[PDB]
Each structure stands twice: as structure tokens, then as C-alpha cells.
Amino acid sequence: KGEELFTGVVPILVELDGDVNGHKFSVRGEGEGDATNGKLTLKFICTTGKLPVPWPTLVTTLVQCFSRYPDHMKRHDFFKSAMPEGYVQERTISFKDDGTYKTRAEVKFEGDTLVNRIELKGIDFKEDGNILGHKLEYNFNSHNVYITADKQKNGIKANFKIRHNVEDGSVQLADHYQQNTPIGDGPVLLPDNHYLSTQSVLSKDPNEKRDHMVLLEFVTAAGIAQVQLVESGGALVQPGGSLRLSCAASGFPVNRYSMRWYRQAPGKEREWVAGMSSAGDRSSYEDSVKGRFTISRDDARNTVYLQMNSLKPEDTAVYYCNVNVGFEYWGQGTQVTVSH
Amino acid sequence: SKGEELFTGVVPILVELDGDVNGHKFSVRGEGEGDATNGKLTLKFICTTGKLPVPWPTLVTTLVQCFSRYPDHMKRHDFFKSAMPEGYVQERTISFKDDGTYKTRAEVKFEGDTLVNRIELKGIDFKEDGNILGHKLEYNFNSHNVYITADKQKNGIKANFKIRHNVEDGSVQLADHYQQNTPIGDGPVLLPDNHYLSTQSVLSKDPNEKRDHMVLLEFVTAAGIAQVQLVESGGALVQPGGSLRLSCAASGFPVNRYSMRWYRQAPGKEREWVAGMSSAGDRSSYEDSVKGRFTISRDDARNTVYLQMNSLKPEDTAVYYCNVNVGFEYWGQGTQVTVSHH
């Protein structure tokens, strides 16, 4: 419903009033988000003069509604679902061996503009530490924001550890705890556990003498696979011996699709071994393994098997299971070794 | 860069295929829209000759790699868009294993606002009772990596890949592709280094179309070359109290203009920062676990970074990664060090 708003490039406005250890400041920023590409372009300015904290410490605080949710996960996007009326975003950010940011923001549409308005309160910072002492490199790393649903408050919670590069070669950790709740009474999408993969790049406007930050960001949602295969049963076995592989299938009925086994020996190419028809009325085997190997499936437990008999050293490989439901899927594989 | 600009928006596609396989003749026509920025394709094809003598999946690779998504760092490596608007000739030999062969020749150029793929296809030596002419192939398509090399003589590229066709009896029908592209104009073009296209396709049908047809959704994105890369070495099995030295080879940036760090991940634990040194090289830092035992350094000449590990304990067992941020964070694949008795 709210997703329709993010189809195009949307003008962004960011407004932050901070206080850290009594040091007060204001940040203002403008740009355009594109959810369609999961892209952000913004320029921020300290309007109060010089910024008392490093710019990277403000990055996570300064619009996750611009994240790119792939089609399959679009049901899991809380952020766009709460718009235009928006959501409240609250964080407690703990810098290790140093002070803490506490933040409260409202991200809503005002006119055609999406507005992030934040109040930020820092405390317990060491004046000689990495933040107030400006010891952090100007850049930003890539992180995964782990999202769970908050059903009690009709919103989400998030947990992630931000890694800030320190100029002496060390790292400054910022523990993020996040909770969002929508502004309106309108119903919202509450997702299952997933994560946002975020990468940012920081820079400066060559012509700008005010204390500022130019920010490009890419966020894309992930962490749920519609289909999953897990192989099991691999082991080390003497020549002439026998073992059985099992694959646990998820995301689809095993009896509505054909399933195949592949194997890859070291240095050689991955080859098809065995397979069976979706109906289960036909099964096929590659020439190397014919008569030795047998494929089968259990419709009830949604699992597929490969029985391997009269094993030879040449059968040594990593064995994979394979299915195509609109898309091809593989398992992580399982290692069988035949020696001597 | 002239030719990239043609692909900035969603552009209409038209495909027209004329073919003969074992004397059986047919024509295919298709249309839709490509988006190169996301590398997405949406097309609908129709056999205009009546019923198609071959399975639709066998025509997929023949039926516009200029719509592949080449990421910013690899944009110098995009031959396909560089040949536009004049376009390129794409030629393939497709050998179906234990069966016949396709020969294809295509011209992909812009005509008006629509990018047009026009193909001649000649099949021969096909078994009338085989998987192709006997229609034994499932209606679907798998995911493949298309390996692209430059062919410098022809001012263009070559490709080699194996398409895997699912057969209805549970088996697989292999189609070996041999590909060569050459530009239509003499205008200079981008010749890439070795890389690959990661392609996924999905097939479906239009409910209101009674003609023999194929509805195709495709996702292609280029990969296999990073502007910046870290490769660790030196991981091994080591006795407690022993020593080993890890090295990381860096590419795409001077090791002396950027800070480099080492991280490690023990099994079941979270990845932790171990050691690092300033971009200038005047400061280096170490975590409490490793303090005094570990030493980081770098060789500006060989553009390499080291980690010396002394008085090793079992707890030092982990995969060790090297880390740098040039505009983006980069990791190596890591190297495994194991500390245990013999």
C-alpha cells in the first residue's frame, strides 16, 4: 500500500538536534532516496559550526524505508507499510568503553518529501576518547542489521554492532538496539527474522567549507530463502562399501518437482549423477554410477535419498541435491570420501 | 560511455528468430522490455509458424547480454553496451550431448528506441527420437555462469559455458555453448578481462495466448572481478606455544595509503578484531587477547601485509581475515589456522 510511494526517486530531508556531554549541535541534510535501487544520496551540514562528534558516529542515526526489498521479501517490509504516516525510530547506541547515544526519530512524509527528524542525546563520553577526541577514520564499513518483529508494540526491533575504524589501527564498537513503532493506527507488515545488508561510502563536497558529510548508501534486504535443501550422510568409506545420503527439502512439496543429485570431485567439473521425475514414475542415472546408485524420495517427510553401493575411489566428491521451482536451488553439499 | 547511456532507462526489446533444425523450419518473434540497471529482462516469444518443433528452453540462450548488470567497478569491462548503437554480431555453436547441433548467428543493435536481436539458426544431426525433437525437456531453465574472455584479435569477446536442461525422466541434457562476439562498427570498444555473467531465468505462459509461446523473466548480473582484493595465506596446523606468520596480498590500492586490519572468527563465535596499523604506518594496535604475542607489519614494495603470531594457544584457532576500507569495506576469503596437539 505504502510501497507505491517509493516507486520513484523521493526527496529526503533530515533534521537532527543533538546534545552530547553538553556539547550541542544541529545537523541538516537533503538528497534523494531510491528504493527501487536501494540507493541513497545525501549531503549533511552542521548548521551550528564545527561538529563535536565524528560524522561516522551519526551515520546510523541520520531512513530504512529506502532499503531494497526483493519481490519475495516484500511482505516483510515494515518500513514502507507504515508510510506516509510513518514510524517512530528509537535507538540506544553503546560505544564500547565510552559513552552512549540515545535517539528518537520520526520518519514520515510531509508533502512529497520524506522527513527524518531526530532528537539525539549523548552522555558519559570521555573527552579524551575516540568520539569526543575525534580519533575515528572518515569512512564507514558494511554491516548486517538484524530485524525481528515486535508484536507487543506493533513494530520491529533491530540489533547490530557497528564497527568504526580508529586512526591507530584499532576498532571502535557501537552496540545498536533499535525499536520501531508506526505513527498511525493503520495496520502494518510485521516480518519474520531477516536482515538488511548495508554498505555506505563517505566523502566531502570539494567546494564546501562548512562542516559536512556527503553520503552514498546501498541497503538490500535478505535472510530468507523461499526454498532450501540440506544434504546429509556424507562420510569416509572403504572401497566396495556403501552409504546413503539424505536431503531435507523446504519451501515446496517434494512430489510436485523433479529432484536430482550432482557431485563435484576436486579439480573436475560438477556432474549430474541421478534424478527422478516429479511424478516419481521415472528415475535416471549417469553412466558411471548406473546400477550402483539408487534415488528415492519420501513424500511425507519431504526428503530425498541417494543410495550408493559398490563405492569406488572415483565416487569421491562433494554431493549436492538440486531442484528447480521457477528458479534453481542447491544445497550446501555433503562430502563423501572413498579411500583406500 | 556513449553506449551506456542507451541503457540508463527501461528499453523496449524486439527479438526475431528464423530457424531450421533437421529440415523442420520455424519462426519466433518476441517483445518486452529490458532494464540493464537491475539486469532484469521480461519477454514474451511466439512461434509464428504454428507449433514449435523444438523445446522452448533450447532457444533461451539464443533468444541480449547488453542488458546484463555490470557494476560500477566492472563498467570498463562491458563490451556489450560499448558496441551500441551500431551493435555486435553474436555467433554460437551449441552442441547437445549425444544429439544434434545448433549454429546461430545474430545481430544485436538498436533500431529506433528498441533494441533488436535478429537470429539465424540452423540445427543438424538431431535425433527425431531424442530429447530435443522428441520434446523430453521439462519446461523451465536453470542458473548458469557464462564465462567471458576477451578475444583481442577480433576486437571482441568469447564465451564458453554448459547449459543444463532438465529432462522429464530425471536426467539432464547438456548443451555446450561456444560463443564469439564481434562489433559491427570499427569504433573502439571495451575489451574486458576474464569475468562471468551470473544468469537466472524463469519460464511461464500467457493464459490468453493460444499460440505456441514462451514467457520469460531473466536476471543477469556481471561478476568475478573486484577493483580491490585481499588474499590471505599462511594458515596451517600448529602446536600450542608455536608460531606462524600470515600474509595478505592486496590489489587495487597502495597498502601505504590505507589502514589494514586483521580479524578472526572462531567456530561458533562472532568475528572479532585482532590487529591493525595506521594508514601512515606510524601506529599499530592489538586486542587484549593477543597483546605482546602478535605483531603486524606491511611491505610497501610488495604491497603486502603480515601478521606474526607467537606463543599460540588453542583459542587462537580461527579463520583469520584481513580488512581494508577504500570507499567500501573489503575482506579476503580468509585463511584457517588451527592450534592443537599432534
XYZ file of C-alpha atoms in Angstrom:
682
model
C 0.000 0.000 0.000
C 2.678 2.457 1.117
C 5.186 0.808 -1.210
C 3.716 2.761 -4.130
C 5.210 5.951 -2.681
C 8.775 4.670 -3.056
C 8.498 3.610 -6.708
C 10.244 6.806 -7.772
C 13.115 8.944 -6.543
C 11.953 10.564 -3.316
C 13.356 13.842 -1.935
C 14.697 13.416 1.594
C 15.034 15.861 4.453
C 16.971 15.036 7.606
C 16.899 17.190 10.741
C 18.824 16.411 13.911
C 19.156 18.360 17.170
C 21.896 16.878 19.269
C 23.361 17.187 22.717
C 26.453 15.138 23.608
C 28.103 15.663 27.011
C 26.614 19.152 26.993
C 28.050 19.864 23.557
C 25.094 20.934 21.450
C 24.713 20.974 17.681
C 22.300 20.699 14.779
C 22.526 18.721 11.558
C 20.509 19.309 8.413
C 20.594 17.206 5.282
C 18.983 16.817 1.889
C 19.050 14.437 -1.058
C 17.122 11.679 -2.796
C 16.457 8.078 -1.889
C 15.630 5.431 -4.445
C 14.109 2.263 -3.014
C 13.906 0.942 -6.494
C 17.697 0.676 -6.453
C 18.062 0.654 -2.678
C 20.175 3.795 -3.134
C 20.685 6.932 -1.037
C 22.441 10.203 -1.886
C 22.618 12.866 0.809
C 24.614 15.868 1.979
C 24.588 16.830 5.646
C 25.720 20.065 7.257
C 26.392 21.067 10.832
C 24.490 24.347 10.943
C 25.884 25.148 14.384
C 29.510 25.401 13.280
C 32.003 22.612 13.983
C 30.656 19.134 14.806
C 31.658 17.982 18.334
C 31.473 14.296 17.358
C 32.814 12.396 14.339
C 30.492 12.219 11.325
C 30.629 8.388 11.190
C 29.035 8.160 14.654
C 25.962 9.921 13.264
C 25.551 7.753 10.152
C 23.131 5.135 11.505
C 21.035 7.865 13.130
C 20.820 10.149 10.085
C 15.672 6.181 6.691
C 15.445 2.405 6.294
C 12.245 2.781 4.253
C 14.579 3.211 1.282
C 16.001 -0.298 1.612
C 15.548 -2.545 -1.416
C 13.277 -5.466 -0.608
C 13.377 -8.169 -3.296
C 9.967 -9.283 -4.568
C 9.859 -12.431 -2.452
C 10.513 -10.465 0.755
C 8.216 -7.501 0.016
C 5.722 -8.912 2.530
C 8.402 -8.391 5.188
C 8.872 -4.667 4.664
C 7.520 -2.826 7.697
C 9.087 0.485 6.771
C 7.133 1.313 3.615
C 3.961 -0.222 5.050
C 3.751 2.417 7.787
C 4.086 5.316 5.339
C 3.038 8.073 4.548
C 2.007 8.465 8.198
C 5.361 6.998 9.196
C 7.085 5.408 12.174
C 8.986 6.273 15.343
C 12.568 5.009 15.345
C 14.331 4.741 18.700
C 17.900 3.643 19.388
C 20.287 3.160 22.271
C 23.838 3.175 20.936
C 26.580 1.958 23.236
C 30.125 2.833 22.231
C 32.389 0.279 23.924
C 34.478 1.679 26.795
C 32.836 5.044 26.116
C 29.546 6.950 26.199
C 26.070 6.292 24.818
C 23.747 7.888 22.267
C 20.019 7.740 22.907
C 17.921 8.699 19.889
C 14.285 9.253 18.974
C 13.273 9.923 15.385
C 10.111 10.314 13.349
C 10.214 9.337 9.690
C 7.088 10.423 7.843
C 6.020 12.031 4.593
C 5.402 15.761 4.586
C 4.114 16.746 1.174
C 6.250 14.939 -1.397
C 9.206 14.943 0.984
C 10.139 12.084 3.308
C 11.363 13.598 6.559
C 13.622 12.111 9.213
C 13.552 14.302 12.309
C 15.777 13.204 15.171
C 16.477 14.206 18.743
C 19.824 12.823 19.957
C 21.188 12.777 23.497
C 24.714 11.595 24.260
C 26.127 11.000 27.755
C 29.147 9.535 29.579
C 31.602 10.226 26.761
C 35.297 10.606 27.541
C 36.598 13.953 26.288
C 39.893 12.193 25.584
C 38.220 9.167 23.994
C 37.681 8.159 20.365
C 34.437 10.107 19.873
C 34.901 13.485 21.563
C 38.619 13.206 20.808
C 37.922 12.693 17.091
C 40.025 9.538 16.640
C 37.764 7.808 14.107
C 38.702 7.459 10.438
C 36.365 9.133 7.982
C 34.643 6.194 6.290
C 32.030 3.537 7.018
C 32.016 -0.272 6.913
C 29.401 -2.785 5.750
C 27.005 -4.242 8.325
C 24.004 -6.534 8.675
C 21.045 -5.068 10.553
C 19.226 -7.981 12.167
C 15.480 -7.411 12.319
C 12.889 -9.193 14.432
C 9.215 -8.318 14.772
C 7.936 -6.575 17.867
C 4.353 -7.755 18.215
C 3.769 -6.096 21.572
C 4.361 -2.613 20.198
C 3.166 -3.401 16.640
C 6.569 -2.857 15.068
C 10.086 -4.211 14.750
C 13.206 -4.461 16.847
C 16.730 -4.448 15.435
C 20.153 -5.479 16.743
C 23.607 -4.829 15.180
C 27.199 -3.979 16.044
C 28.704 -1.059 14.165
C 32.451 -1.162 13.591
C 34.207 2.213 13.463
C 37.790 2.277 12.200
C 40.100 4.092 14.623
C 43.129 6.027 13.323
C 45.612 3.949 15.349
C 44.599 0.704 13.655
C 42.023 -0.334 16.240
C 38.231 -0.595 16.060
C 35.524 1.256 17.986
C 32.379 -0.809 18.547
C 28.930 0.767 18.696
C 26.177 -1.508 20.001
C 22.859 -0.693 18.367
C 19.487 -1.521 19.860
C 16.547 -0.400 17.777
C 12.774 -0.424 18.090
C 10.237 0.965 15.626
C 6.519 1.630 16.018
C 4.158 3.220 13.466
C 2.707 6.711 13.884
C -0.771 5.857 12.592
C -3.333 3.280 13.693
C -3.155 1.793 10.202
C -2.207 -1.903 10.020
C 1.432 -2.746 9.308
C 3.528 -5.620 7.986
C 5.345 -7.462 10.747
C 8.107 -9.596 9.211
C 9.936 -12.713 10.317
C 13.599 -12.580 11.288
C 15.708 -11.161 8.460
C 18.468 -8.627 7.888
C 19.389 -5.531 5.902
C 22.757 -5.670 4.175
C 24.091 -2.134 4.325
C 27.145 -0.546 2.756
C 27.947 3.165 2.907
C 30.624 5.424 1.448
C 31.576 8.803 2.889
C 33.038 11.823 1.125
C 33.211 15.620 1.018
C 31.993 18.418 -1.241
C 35.204 19.992 -2.620
C 33.527 23.398 -2.584
C 32.002 23.226 0.915
C 33.830 24.860 3.850
C 31.106 24.163 6.416
C 31.433 21.003 8.485
C 29.599 18.488 6.336
C 29.163 14.900 5.146
C 28.372 13.557 1.675
C 26.831 10.099 1.906
C 26.072 7.335 -0.588
C 24.371 4.215 0.765
C 23.162 0.848 -0.510
C 20.757 -1.266 1.529
C 19.175 -4.518 0.363
C 17.036 -6.922 2.376
C 17.932 -10.600 2.704
C 17.993 -13.516 5.127
C 15.051 -15.592 3.934
C 15.265 -18.240 1.239
C 11.995 -19.363 -0.324
C 13.489 -22.792 -0.996
C 16.138 -24.751 0.924
C 17.978 -28.055 0.529
C 20.144 -29.596 3.235
C 22.182 -32.683 2.372
C 23.322 -35.207 4.967
C 25.027 -38.586 5.196
C 28.484 -37.890 3.801
C 31.365 -39.828 5.371
C 34.664 -41.623 4.653
C 34.193 -45.155 3.333
C 36.348 -48.088 2.194
C 36.185 -49.188 -1.466
C 33.306 -51.573 -2.116
C 31.393 -50.155 0.832
C 28.061 -48.350 0.888
C 26.403 -45.231 2.248
C 23.150 -43.304 1.938
C 22.607 -39.574 1.512
C 19.517 -37.692 2.584
C 18.376 -34.222 1.611
C 15.800 -32.332 3.634
C 13.667 -30.155 1.388
C 11.887 -26.971 2.428
C 9.691 -24.447 0.647
C 7.985 -26.927 -1.668
C 6.374 -30.388 -1.856
C 8.945 -32.987 -2.932
C 6.388 -34.859 -5.059
C 5.492 -31.901 -7.291
C 9.027 -31.390 -8.631
C 11.871 -33.451 -10.077
C 14.922 -33.763 -7.832
C 18.480 -34.524 -8.917
C 21.855 -35.331 -7.389
C 25.112 -33.782 -8.567
C 28.698 -34.338 -7.481
C 31.954 -32.428 -7.830
C 35.312 -34.143 -7.426
C 38.296 -31.898 -6.672
C 39.658 -30.217 -9.795
C 36.971 -31.668 -12.062
C 33.642 -30.106 -13.087
C 30.349 -30.686 -11.279
C 28.484 -33.570 -12.908
C 24.918 -34.853 -12.758
C 24.615 -38.213 -11.003
C 20.989 -39.240 -10.581
C 17.459 -37.875 -10.762
C 13.783 -38.769 -10.632
C 10.650 -37.433 -12.340
C 8.296 -35.081 -10.490
C 5.632 -37.789 -10.669
C 8.114 -40.373 -9.417
C 7.394 -42.783 -12.263
C 10.838 -42.451 -13.865
C 14.379 -42.381 -12.495
C 17.658 -41.835 -14.330
C 21.341 -42.357 -13.559
C 24.603 -41.280 -15.190
C 26.674 -43.963 -16.914
C 29.444 -44.025 -14.299
C 27.061 -44.874 -11.447
C 24.447 -46.969 -13.289
C 23.164 -49.956 -11.318
C 25.276 -48.993 -8.313
C 23.283 -45.927 -7.260
C 19.597 -45.584 -6.426
C 17.492 -42.454 -5.955
C 14.279 -42.299 -3.924
C 12.083 -39.872 -2.010
C 9.686 -39.775 0.922
C 6.702 -37.571 0.089
C 5.631 -37.471 3.739
C 8.905 -36.355 5.324
C 9.706 -34.267 2.240
C 13.151 -35.828 1.884
C 15.178 -37.303 -0.970
C 17.733 -40.107 -0.850
C 20.657 -41.444 -2.835
C 21.827 -44.956 -2.045
C 25.415 -45.542 -3.097
C 26.703 -49.098 -3.354
C 29.966 -50.680 -4.507
C 31.706 -47.354 -3.963
C 34.886 -46.668 -5.891
C 37.606 -44.050 -5.257
C 36.233 -42.246 -8.330
C 32.980 -41.681 -6.416
C 34.824 -39.385 -4.012
C 33.320 -35.906 -4.341
C 31.026 -33.375 -2.714
C 27.446 -34.436 -3.419
C 24.747 -31.829 -3.992
C 20.976 -32.046 -4.305
C 19.127 -29.959 -6.865
C 15.644 -28.677 -7.654
C 14.078 -26.056 -9.898
C 10.970 -24.298 -8.685
C 10.818 -21.337 -11.064
C 14.452 -20.989 -10.002
C 17.246 -23.490 -9.441
C 18.337 -24.261 -5.876
C 21.308 -26.161 -4.470
C 22.190 -27.465 -1.032
C 25.442 -26.683 0.761
C 26.551 -30.171 -0.222
C 27.949 -33.145 1.667
C 31.390 -34.723 1.385
C 31.879 -38.404 0.660
C 35.420 -39.767 0.506
C 36.357 -43.191 -0.821
C 39.826 -44.476 0.052
C 41.904 -46.603 0.055
C 30.105 5.673 -22.041
C 28.161 6.819 -25.090
C 26.610 3.367 -25.247
C 25.953 3.017 -21.516
C 23.523 5.910 -21.786
C 21.262 3.974 -24.122
C 20.713 1.522 -21.266
C 20.084 4.000 -18.412
C 16.321 3.500 -18.678
C 13.976 0.598 -19.297
C 14.202 -0.084 -23.025
C 11.796 -1.999 -25.340
C 13.158 -5.218 -26.839
C 12.267 -6.997 -30.062
C 13.517 -10.484 -30.918
C 13.096 -12.237 -34.258
C 14.356 -15.752 -34.894
C 14.385 -17.779 -38.097
C 15.442 -21.402 -37.808
C 15.828 -24.791 -39.444
C 16.609 -27.933 -37.456
C 16.800 -31.235 -39.349
C 14.798 -29.559 -42.106
C 11.984 -28.591 -39.757
C 11.540 -24.863 -40.219
C 10.083 -22.282 -37.852
C 9.998 -18.620 -36.889
C 9.946 -16.969 -33.481
C 9.076 -13.387 -32.634
C 9.273 -11.791 -29.224
C 8.971 -8.487 -27.427
C 9.255 -6.977 -23.971
C 11.441 -4.583 -22.026
C 14.952 -4.818 -20.632
C 16.353 -2.988 -17.639
C 20.158 -3.032 -17.591
C 20.429 -1.084 -14.330
C 18.959 -4.023 -12.400
C 19.901 -6.526 -15.096
C 16.299 -7.639 -15.471
C 14.533 -8.910 -18.602
C 10.859 -9.526 -19.315
C 9.892 -11.024 -22.665
C 7.165 -12.938 -24.469
C 8.010 -15.068 -27.500
C 5.685 -16.644 -30.054
C 6.174 -19.243 -32.766
C 4.565 -17.632 -35.809
C 4.867 -20.793 -37.896
C 2.445 -22.801 -35.785
C 3.780 -25.348 -33.306
C 7.466 -25.189 -32.343
C 9.446 -28.293 -33.463
C 11.956 -27.879 -30.610
C 11.501 -27.315 -26.872
C 11.339 -23.652 -25.834
C 14.212 -23.975 -23.311
C 16.657 -24.885 -26.111
C 16.049 -21.467 -27.648
C 16.602 -19.444 -24.467
C 20.330 -18.679 -24.734
C 19.875 -17.838 -28.409
C 16.874 -15.585 -27.789
C 20.703 -9.773 -25.352
C 23.584 -9.765 -22.867
C 23.851 -5.989 -23.273
C 21.132 -5.951 -20.603
C 23.410 -7.601 -18.059
C 24.073 -5.514 -14.981
C 27.711 -4.521 -14.944
C 28.502 -2.975 -11.556
C 30.344 0.361 -11.484
C 33.784 -1.153 -10.871
C 33.319 -3.511 -13.851
C 31.871 -0.919 -16.258
C 35.188 -0.765 -18.124
C 34.707 -4.472 -18.797
C 31.346 -4.191 -20.519
C 31.826 -4.994 -24.202
C 28.132 -5.347 -24.957
C 26.958 -1.796 -24.247
C 30.205 -0.390 -25.644
C 29.328 -1.721 -29.101
C 26.000 0.128 -29.194
C 24.248 1.715 -31.051
C 25.999 0.014 -34.003
C 25.874 -3.297 -32.158
C 27.631 -6.651 -32.390
C 27.436 -9.993 -34.168
C 26.885 -12.919 -31.816
C 27.742 -16.380 -33.108
C 27.278 -19.661 -31.270
C 27.784 -23.356 -31.788
C 25.547 -25.307 -29.439
C 26.321 -28.997 -29.181
C 23.650 -31.032 -27.451
C 25.391 -34.066 -25.995
C 24.578 -37.345 -27.767
C 22.406 -35.324 -30.155
C 22.487 -32.646 -32.861
C 23.976 -29.155 -33.074
C 22.648 -25.598 -33.342
C 24.503 -22.988 -35.375
C 23.421 -19.436 -34.613
C 24.301 -16.014 -35.975
C 22.733 -12.889 -34.545
C 22.926 -9.136 -34.923
C 22.076 -7.139 -31.825
C 21.756 -3.419 -32.491
C 19.414 -0.551 -31.693
C 16.642 0.115 -34.175
C 14.827 3.282 -33.215
C 14.220 3.203 -29.467
C 14.013 -0.600 -29.356
C 16.990 -2.942 -29.095
C 16.594 -5.673 -31.688
C 18.013 -9.191 -31.698
C 17.797 -10.882 -35.102
C 18.868 -14.510 -35.316
C 19.517 -17.162 -37.938
C 19.506 -20.691 -36.530
C 20.481 -23.918 -38.284
C 20.171 -27.238 -36.476
C 21.549 -30.514 -37.857
C 22.182 -34.150 -36.877
C 19.337 -34.206 -34.361
C 17.684 -37.466 -33.331
C 13.972 -37.324 -34.147
C 13.500 -39.606 -31.141
C 15.896 -37.726 -28.846
C 15.309 -35.235 -26.029
C 15.047 -32.238 -28.358
C 12.936 -33.327 -31.332
C 11.115 -35.788 -29.067
C 10.223 -32.999 -26.621
C 11.560 -34.671 -23.465
C 12.795 -31.478 -21.790
C 10.972 -30.003 -18.799
C 9.601 -26.505 -19.243
C 11.948 -24.436 -17.077
C 15.519 -23.138 -17.078
C 18.492 -23.450 -14.741
C 21.056 -20.979 -13.404
C 24.450 -20.721 -15.084
C 27.701 -18.777 -15.069
C 28.717 -17.501 -18.512
C 32.495 -17.155 -18.699
C 33.682 -14.211 -20.753
C 37.196 -13.762 -22.043
C 38.482 -11.108 -24.393
C 39.453 -12.130 -27.897
C 41.844 -9.342 -28.805
C 42.242 -10.294 -32.476
C 38.579 -9.794 -33.309
C 38.208 -6.680 -31.148
C 35.634 -8.534 -29.082
C 34.850 -11.340 -26.651
C 34.472 -15.107 -26.483
C 32.426 -17.292 -24.148
C 32.326 -20.929 -23.030
C 29.574 -22.489 -20.918
C 27.464 -25.597 -20.311
C 23.693 -25.208 -20.234
C 21.923 -27.870 -18.180
C 18.471 -28.859 -19.436
C 16.289 -30.851 -17.044
C 14.829 -33.940 -18.731
C 11.381 -35.291 -17.796
C 12.809 -38.694 -16.837
C 15.005 -37.142 -14.157
C 18.129 -36.825 -16.288
C 19.933 -33.797 -17.698
C 20.535 -32.738 -21.296
C 23.797 -30.853 -21.742
C 24.191 -28.092 -24.296
C 27.778 -26.977 -24.762
C 27.922 -23.362 -25.849
C 30.784 -21.848 -27.799
C 30.325 -18.138 -28.291
C 32.096 -15.326 -30.091
C 31.026 -11.704 -30.407
C 32.420 -9.021 -32.703
C 31.322 -5.392 -33.015
C 29.544 -4.190 -36.150
C 31.368 -0.845 -36.298
C 35.118 -0.146 -36.171
C 34.678 2.323 -33.325
C 36.878 1.208 -30.444
C 35.180 -0.908 -27.809
C 35.800 -2.031 -24.270
C 37.691 -5.312 -24.159
C 37.314 -6.850 -20.731
C 39.423 -9.096 -18.570
C 38.209 -12.549 -17.627
C 34.858 -12.379 -15.846
C 31.478 -14.087 -15.819
C 27.775 -13.359 -16.106
C 25.580 -14.877 -13.405
C 22.256 -15.615 -15.077
C 18.921 -16.898 -13.767
C 15.846 -17.489 -15.930
C 12.231 -18.448 -15.219
C 9.674 -19.671 -17.762
C 5.882 -19.298 -17.793
C 2.818 -18.891 -20.026
C 0.310 -16.205 -21.008
C -3.195 -17.559 -20.175
C -4.840 -15.691 -23.058
C -2.403 -16.818 -25.719
C -3.453 -19.890 -27.689
C -0.403 -19.745 -29.972
C 2.731 -21.689 -29.088
C 4.628 -19.253 -26.909
C 7.102 -18.612 -24.089
C 7.001 -16.013 -21.316
C 10.471 -15.374 -19.937
C 11.763 -13.482 -16.915
C 15.541 -13.215 -16.623
C 18.149 -11.833 -14.225
C 21.732 -11.282 -15.354
C 24.472 -9.631 -13.305
C 28.200 -9.485 -14.054
C 30.849 -10.551 -11.539
C 34.240 -12.144 -10.912
C 36.413 -9.027 -10.845
C 36.805 -6.681 -7.884
C 38.544 -3.302 -8.113
C 40.135 -4.071 -4.741
C 41.021 -7.523 -3.437
C 42.693 -9.145 -0.423
C 44.157 -12.656 -0.451
C 45.377 -14.225 2.796
C 47.961 -17.006 3.002
C 49.900 -18.915 5.639
C 47.207 -20.718 7.613
C 48.228 -24.129 8.922
C 48.110 -26.575 11.816
C 50.412 -25.546 14.639
C 51.402 -26.876 18.057
C 50.425 -24.846 21.147
C 53.196 -22.406 22.071
C 54.357 -22.483 18.464
C 54.405 -19.753 15.838
C 53.170 -18.905 12.369
C 53.061 -15.853 10.144
C 50.116 -14.858 7.973
C 50.436 -12.784 4.821
C 47.835 -10.930 2.786
C 48.374 -9.827 -0.800
C 46.484 -6.647 -1.648
C 45.438 -5.466 -5.101
C 43.744 -2.334 -6.400
C 45.246 0.154 -3.950
C 48.518 1.161 -2.261
C 48.984 -0.590 1.084
C 50.682 2.524 2.463
C 47.794 4.948 1.903
C 45.231 2.900 3.859
C 44.912 1.268 7.262
C 44.826 -2.525 7.240
C 43.358 -4.744 9.935
C 43.192 -8.403 10.847
C 40.010 -10.077 12.053
C 39.392 -13.653 13.150
C 36.362 -15.880 13.613
C 36.480 -18.880 15.926
C 33.974 -21.652 15.207
C 30.573 -20.742 16.624
C 31.808 -17.332 17.774
C 31.459 -13.861 16.296
C 34.187 -12.322 14.147
C 36.482 -10.154 16.268
C 39.113 -7.534 15.517
C 42.647 -8.703 16.338
C 45.242 -6.271 14.947
C 45.641 -3.239 12.698
C 48.004 -0.468 11.624
C 47.550 3.190 10.672
C 47.436 4.231 7.013
C 50.639 6.188 7.622
C 52.243 3.199 9.326
C 53.195 5.204 12.404
C 50.787 3.383 14.726
C 49.686 -0.226 15.166
C 47.152 -1.684 17.609
C 46.330 -5.096 19.085
C 43.450 -6.595 21.073
C 43.988 -7.695 24.684
C 43.820 -11.415 23.834
C 46.818 -11.124 21.522
C 48.801 -8.263 23.110
C 52.580 -8.707 23.014
C 52.186 -12.046 21.250
C 51.089 -10.704 17.866
C 52.864 -8.288 15.560
C 51.507 -6.581 12.448
C 53.608 -5.064 9.673
C 53.498 -4.305 5.969
C 55.807 -4.303 2.971
C 55.116 -1.235 0.843
C 57.107 -2.645 -2.073
C 55.308 -5.980 -2.433
C 52.033 -4.327 -1.375
C 51.526 -6.999 1.276
C 50.526 -7.112 4.937
C 51.707 -9.533 7.620
C 50.658 -10.862 10.997
C 53.252 -12.560 13.191
C 51.706 -14.910 15.724
C 53.770 -16.159 18.671
C 53.109 -18.360 21.716
C 49.943 -19.683 20.100
C 47.108 -21.047 22.214
C 44.194 -23.302 21.160
C 41.940 -20.225 21.433
C 43.820 -18.681 18.512
C 42.243 -21.320 16.292
C 40.023 -19.439 13.845
C 39.746 -18.265 10.269
C 41.843 -15.117 10.011
C 40.685 -12.349 7.696
C 42.382 -9.181 6.510
C 40.397 -5.986 6.155
C 40.593 -2.630 4.417
C 38.214 0.199 3.623
C 38.750 2.038 0.368
C 35.342 3.677 -0.048
C 33.886 0.301 0.848
C 34.842 -2.420 3.306
C 36.680 -5.360 1.760
C 37.539 -8.766 3.142
C 39.736 -11.595 1.995
C 38.451 -15.148 1.731
C 40.385 -15.857 4.910
C 42.931 -18.468 5.944
C 42.495 -21.195 8.537
C 44.884 -21.528 11.456
C 44.474 -24.467 13.813
C 46.277 -24.786 17.122
C 46.174 -28.297 18.541
C 48.421 -31.181 19.573
C 49.568 -33.943 17.235
